[model samples]
Target: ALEQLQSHIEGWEGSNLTDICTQLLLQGTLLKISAGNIQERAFFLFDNLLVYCKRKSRVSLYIFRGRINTEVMEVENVEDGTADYHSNGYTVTNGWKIHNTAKNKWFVCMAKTAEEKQKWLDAIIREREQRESLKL
Candidate 1:
């Protein structure tokens, strides 16, 4: 479960994970953008965090929290946040991407299928909205 993963990371030097709020909001194996090429990474989206870990270990590479804007878009040789996507580039593929407000970083995530990609994107938006509404 994600609890075990969290247990290993929540105590790291800069980890600010406080109390656990929810179980696994969404979990999947997606193709992540590396230095240049892409590699498979296991990602877990939780109430307060969007974390991705090593393929088979609890080692986390990213742990984004707070308001994250996630959407389905084409990932190619694009610049900036508002670029139109097409299916005609080297990294041209329909996938989900995340924008972390606090960190000012973006992550491109590709699922196994188009449906899978859309499903998780919907789940992330739904979960984030639900959490925000509860806070008011």
Candidate 2:
């Protein structure tokens, strides 16, 4: 599945996804909240990394956006109706935050429903725990 996913991604030349120990955990589309707008982004959660991409209209191809190392990443849920000033007063209901401690960078994402948010949270946390144990 990783190979298949890689095939559909543009600008993925230097991004390596062929590690034998690396596994793709969860993947889906979510609303990425930014200071100016909210857009749909395809998130790919791997055992060691979190990658996101942008789509070209309704095309099947995905444009590589960026990646976060799971080792220094944190995931947290945002309660419903929380207004965020950074997002131009956008209120989040089924939303979550992804923070990368190493880079001091963060991103907000909104799922289609609360259930979907929980699923993403669980999967990301599970992978973090697994990676933590491997380090120790």
lDDT of 2 by residue, 20-78 (tens): 32688988899988646788999989988888899878724899987887777877778
Best by lDDT: 2
RMSD of each: 6.6, 2.5
Tell me the TM-score of each prediction against the true structure. Answer: 0.62, 0.86
Pairs in clash, predicted candidate 1: none
Residue 114 local lDDT, model 1: 70
Model 1 regions more than 4 Å off:
7-13, 16-20, 57-89, 101-103
Off by over 4 Å in 2: 58-60, 101-103, 134-136
lDDT value, residue 17 of candidate 1 = 36
Residue 83 in model 1: shift from native, Å?
10
Clash count per candidate: 0, 0
Please give the CA lDDT of all the candidate structures.
0.54, 0.81
Worst 10-residue stretch by lDDT in candidate 2?
13-22
